[PDB]
Every structure is written in structure tokens, then in C-alpha cells.
């Protein structure tokens with residue numbers, strides 16, 4: 001009547017044989033879970049990593065949250081310990097419902113959350129912990145050096161599902177990246193309380209994300225499959241246009257809370273789940289998700305990218321360009337980095353990188369033919385990867401340049417990508433200089449190495 005819960009997302013219970021490699025399993029369930037955007041993974045019953053940290057020595061600065069639907073939100077009172085936050089959180093929920101925290105039905109909290117964010121008369125604010133591990137504060141999973149060690153203990157250190165490991169693993173193409181992308185490579189830690197929420201969003205570069213709830217009360221999720229992404233965006237733009245006025249920066253991205261029933265009304269497929277302690281939630285590329293916490297809990301999450309994602313990664317950078325959105329990293333620079341490490345790549349990875357590189361080269365060849373016909377004649381090799389990101393973003397579309405860019409001595413330090421040659425200045429194109437990383441004759445042997453590796 002007021003809230004009709006979306007259908008449940010897929011729940012997977014793999015045997016230990018299937019649970020062996022995360023990426024093999026993710027590839028296995030992909031045809032199913034990609035249709036819902038999110039899926040839940042219950043590990044085999046005896047897979048129980050030890051959570052152990054001092055509640056008094058762990059301290060963090062909490063972010064404050066107003067609970068209002070369609071109200072804009074962004075990033076950066078009090079400094080909590082994990083204990084003092086927990087005492088505040090437990091007290092809040094206890095007072096809100098006048099009940100012991102574990103007698104409050106999940107269905108009630110869900111219904112109450114959506115009633116709360118709708119009503120203007122209700123001005124409930126909550127606090128949330130959201131930060132990258134930094135030994136301040138460190139990961140909830142076990143990490144190396146300290147304690148010799150036992151078989152079970154040491155297993156959780158090397159496990160694929162240890163979220164400290166999955167970034168630097170072999171099929172996460174993000175691991176080969178040498179540029180600083182700390183926000184996209186290191187696990188995030190979320191300390192939640194009742195009604196603390198995360199707004200509708202997709203990951204940077206449309207990456208996967210995997211989320212683990214270490215302990216505490218459930219985390220309620222809502223998910224939308226990647227194919228219905230622009231459906232959702234169209235729906236939201238008509239209801240809250242102020243969120244789509246393009247941001248000055250990545251730190252100024254606008255997001256919001258929105259009732260899934262509103263989405264379902266406009267025929268956007270939405271799915272839900274209650275993630276309990278010791279369970280994984282996996283989000284797929286361009287899959288919109290949001291949710292809230294049922295109570296005091298502790299979650300850990302990290303982004304990652306499979307070889308399945310490479311074409312989508314390229315598509316995303318193109319999409320960013322049309323939106324004039326900033327990139328976290330250069331997609332092309334990543335490809336060329338892997339190509340240069342062809343002899344030590346996995347052979348299926350090398351096969352997939354070759355395919356994306358083939359597209360990159362052909363697109364680059366066409367672009368350079370176009371700018372040559374515009375009158376750009378002078379050219380000079382340039383090692384784009386040496387420049388800081390802010391020193392190699394296109395003046396027009398803000399894309400991070402790597403393969404090529406146009407410069408002119410009129411405006412030192414400034415660059416445009418080959419799509420925006422007419423956007424640099426008023427000088428004639430013969431005054432311009434084409435700055436390139438590789439000649440086409442350099443690129444084909446690079447791709448050829450990948451071909452040999454893939455045998």
C-alpha cells in the first residue's frame with residue numbers, strides 16, 4: 001500500500017569446489033546475476049574468517065546524513081570509537097521503536113525507512129562511517145606480518161574472497177594499473193547504524209563491486225540490472241533534474257535516495273535483498289544500487305574488473321566523454337600497460353586485451369587521419385603517463401589523454417583530445433602539434449605479442 005517490496009535478487013550457495021576461485025564463480029553466475037544487477041553469495045558453512053579488532057582503539061570521524069527522498073547529497077562533528085558509535089547506534093534504534101534491537105522485524109524497518117524519507121515533517125538524522133583502510137582503522141580481513149601461523153588462519157590470508165587480495169589478484173585488470181587509484185583499488189570500510197543509507201549510484205568506470213558484511217544487523221539492498229541503467233537515469237532526471245547539472249569535479253557528484261516503488265511504477269526492474277553477517281553481495285557493471293542498514297554493522301567492500309568488463313570499460317570512458325565527466329584513470333593506458341607485460345599475462349586475459357587493443361588502434365588510426373585532414377601537421381612523441389592527471393585532461397570533455405592530444409604554444413600546458421581539436425584556441429591548425437604516445441608502427445607489434453601469448 002505504502003511500500004510494496006521489490007522481488008528478491010538471486011541467492012547463490014556454492015559448494016567449496018565452486019567457491020575455490022571467486023572469478024570462476026562470478027563468471028559462472030554472470031548470465032543470471034547480470035539480469036538483476038545484484039546477487040547474494042552465501043559462502044560454504046565452515047568458511048568463517050576471523051574478525052578481530054579492538055573496539056576502543058578503532059576511531060573514526062562519522063558522516064552525518066539527512067533522510068530525505070530526492071534531496072541531493074555529496075561528501076565532506078564528533079569522533080567515535082567503534083564502541084561509542086555502537087552504543088549510540090543501539091540507543092537510537094532502541095529509542096526509535098521502543099524495543100530491544102533484535103525484536104525489530106526487518107520488514108518493519110524497511111517500511112519505516114521509506115515512510116521516513118518521504119515525510120517532510122520527519123527530520124531524522126543519522127551518522128555513518130565510510131573510509132578506506134589506512135591502519136587508522138584497518139581492514140576487517142586478516143593481513144600479513146605480525147604473529148608460526150595455523151592452516152585455517154593462513155588460509156583466510158590467501159583466500160580469493162579476502163577483499164585485501166582480490167584487487168591485486170591475477171584477473172583483476174585493475175591490479176596491473178601502476179597509477180595511483182587508491183579509491184578504486186583499496187577496500188572501503190562501512191560502519192552502519194539503523195537507517196544509515198547509500199544513495200543510488202554505479203561504480204567508477206562501471207566496475208564490479210563485492211561487499212562483505214563482517215558482523216552486525218543486516219544490510220538492505222536494492223539493485224537494478226545494467227541494461228536498465230539509462231531507464232533509471234531517465235526516470236530520475238524527470239523527478240530531480242538538479243542532480244544532473246554536471247559536476248565541477250568527481251568530489252562534487254550528486255546522488256540521492258529514491259523509493260524503488262517509484263522506479264517499479266515506471267517499469268524499471270528493481271530487486272532487493274537482506275544481506276546478513278558472513279554473506280557477500282556482488283554488483284555487476286553499470287548496475288545501479290542503493291540501500292540502508294538495519295542496525296549497527298560493519299561492512300567491507302572493493303571494486304574489481306574482470307576481462308568480461310574490458311569492452312564495458314571502454315564504453316564507459318566514451319560515455320564519460322559525452323558527459324564531460326572526469327576519469328579515475330586512462331583506460332587506454334591500462335591496455336598498453338598490459339600489452340607491454342604480454343609475456344607474463346594469463347592467456348585468456350591476453351586474448352581479451354588483444355581484442356580491445358584492436359579496437360583502440362583502429363579508432364586511433366581514424367582519429368589521426370581526421371586531425372591530419374584538419375591541417376595539423378607537426379607532431380612529437382609524448383610520454384603521457386608521466387604527467388599528473390590534472391595536467392592531461394582534455395580542456396573540453398575532461399577525458400584523460402594517453403594515446404594522443406593536440407597542443408598549441410599559444411596556451412602552454414593545455415591539451416584537447418582528438419575529438420575536440422577545434423576547442424583549443426583560435427590559431428590555425430598548422431600552428432598545432434599532435435602529441436602522441438605511440439606511432440601506429442609501434443602499436444601493431446605490441447598487439448602481436450599478445451597474439452603470441454594467447455597462442
Ligand SMILES: O=c1[nH]c(Oc2cnn(Cc3ccccc3)c2)nc2cnccc12
Pocket residue numbers: 063074075076128129130131190197198199209211219299301
Ligand atoms: O554498504 C554500503 N555503504 C555505503 O556507505 C556510504 C554512504 N555514502 N558513501 C559515500 C561517502 C564516502 C566518504 C564520505 C562520505 C560519503 C558511502 N556506500 C556503499 C556503496 N556501494 C555499495 C555499498 C555501500
Ligand SMILES: [Mn+2]
Pocket residue numbers: 201202203209289
Ligand atoms: Mn557501490
Ligand code: NA
Pocket residue numbers: 067068069116117118119120121122123124
Ligand atoms: Na524526511
Ligand SMILES: [Zn+2]
Pocket residue numbers: 394395396397398399416417418419420
Ligand atoms: Zn575531448
Ligand SMILES: [Zn+2]
Pocket residue numbers: 408409410411424425426427431
Ligand atoms: Zn593557439
